[PDB]
Amino acid sequence: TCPFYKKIPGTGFTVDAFQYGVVEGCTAYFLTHFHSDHYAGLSKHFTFPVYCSEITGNLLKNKLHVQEQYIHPLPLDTECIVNGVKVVLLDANHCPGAVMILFYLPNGTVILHTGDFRADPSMERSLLADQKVHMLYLDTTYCSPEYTFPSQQEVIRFAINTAFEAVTLNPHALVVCGTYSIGKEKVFLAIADVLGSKVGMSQEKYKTLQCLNIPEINSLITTDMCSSLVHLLPMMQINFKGLQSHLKKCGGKYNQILAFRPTGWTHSNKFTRIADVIPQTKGNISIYGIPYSEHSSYLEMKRFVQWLKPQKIIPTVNVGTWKSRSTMEKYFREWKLEAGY
Numbered sequence: 558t559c560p561f562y563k564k565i566p567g568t569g570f571t572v573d574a575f576q577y578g579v580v581e582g583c584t585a586y587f588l589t590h591f592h593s594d595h596y597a598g599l600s601k602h603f604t605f606p607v608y609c610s611e612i613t614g615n616l617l618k619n620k621l622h623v624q625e626q627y628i629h630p631l632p633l634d635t636e637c638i639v640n641g642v643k644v645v646l647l648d649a650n651h652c653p654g655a656v657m658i659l660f661y662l663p664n665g666t667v668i669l670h671t672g673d674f675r676a677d678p679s680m681e682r683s684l685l686a687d688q689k690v691h692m693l694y695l696d697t698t699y700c701s702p703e704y705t706f707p708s709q710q711e712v713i714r715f716a717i718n719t720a721f722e723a724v725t726l727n728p729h730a731l732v733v734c735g736t737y738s739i740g741k742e743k744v745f746l747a748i749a750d751v752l753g754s755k756v757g758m759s760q761e762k763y764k765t766l767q768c769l770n771i772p773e774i775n776s777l778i779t780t781d782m783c784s785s786l787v788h789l790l791p792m793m794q795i796n797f798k799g800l801q802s803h804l805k806k807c808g809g810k811y812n813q814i815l816a817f818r819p820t821g822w823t824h825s826n827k828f829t830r831i832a833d834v835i836p837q838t839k840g841n842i843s844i845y846g847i848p849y850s851e852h853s854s855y856l857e858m859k860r861f862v863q864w865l866k867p868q869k870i871i872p873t874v875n876v877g878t879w880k881s882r883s884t885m886e887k888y889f890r891e892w893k894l895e896a897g898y
């Protein structure tokens with residue numbers, strides 16, 4: 558049954574609540590972003606209103622074949638009325654088309670649902686700064702101080718440099734980049750741009766990336782694998798067997814693979830700097846796991862909340878164990894006491 562943390566009080570609304578069937582008393586279903594754990598449930602047979610970003614609307618229509626009469630895309634940064642309630646959608650700094658939702662209840666309560674996000678100081682100058690927020694439904698994915706990671710920019714620099722050096726040393730080396738959902742597109746686009754290649758990929762993937770409004774996209778991606786020296790594969794294939802296989806398929810065009818796995822966090826982060834990252838190598842194949850995160854670090858989360866000063870915090874990730882809940886409530890209380898709200 559739909560859990561409490563996916564329900565918005567004083568409304569007919571739910572958030573990311575498509576896998577419970579008809580939810581008693583839900584008049585509109587909000588979808589923060591196109592990741593499977595959040596859209597699980599949607600298909601062509603859905604006949605309730607769905608509210609979401611334009612990009613999320615492109616993917617619903619094209620990938621899951623939702624009928625257009627049921628997709629209600631909204632512009633970001635704009636006050637809109639849905640079943641008599643004022644709402645705004647804000648950039649969540651997550652994957653393309655990912656949003657946070659502000660709800661302005663009739664009674665004067667204000668609710669912010671972050672959906673999934675990576676907190677940034679740039680958010681401190683959106684429409685959030687203009688009024689008080691009473692309740693916050695918080696993406697707590699990395700709510701613990703062991704979770705530190707580098708900026709997205711330093712990680713991309715590491716990857717551009719690594720790849721440019723490899724292929725310049727050996728122009729017969731192929732670069733591979735794993736994917737299994739939208740997001741983290743900058744990894745493979747920035748590598749391809751420094752190497753003066755297009756990124757080649759399967760048709761289903763090319764379809765997906767065409768839904769995202771990325772500027773100059775036709776210039777950067779292709780389904781012609783042959784003309785490309787940066788290839789995207791499913792994450793599951795990013796291993797020595799999967800990569801020997803793919804190298805066989807390229808017909809003596811290449812003699813070396815350099816491959817990249819964007820992971821969220823890996824415990825090498827507590828000890829190791831981004832400068833210091835090394836690959837796993839077998840023969841003529843090397844695999845780099847790089848810490849490219851689209852969720853908040855513990856410090857970026859703490860700073861956001863301390864800035865926002867919510868009256869109540871409702872965690873939406875890691876809720877399923879008592880030891881996790883308890884740990885999180887401790888940190889919420891720490892942050893409050895430290896900042897004085």
Ligand code: NI
Binds near residue numbers: 590592651673
């Ligand atoms: Ni997500």
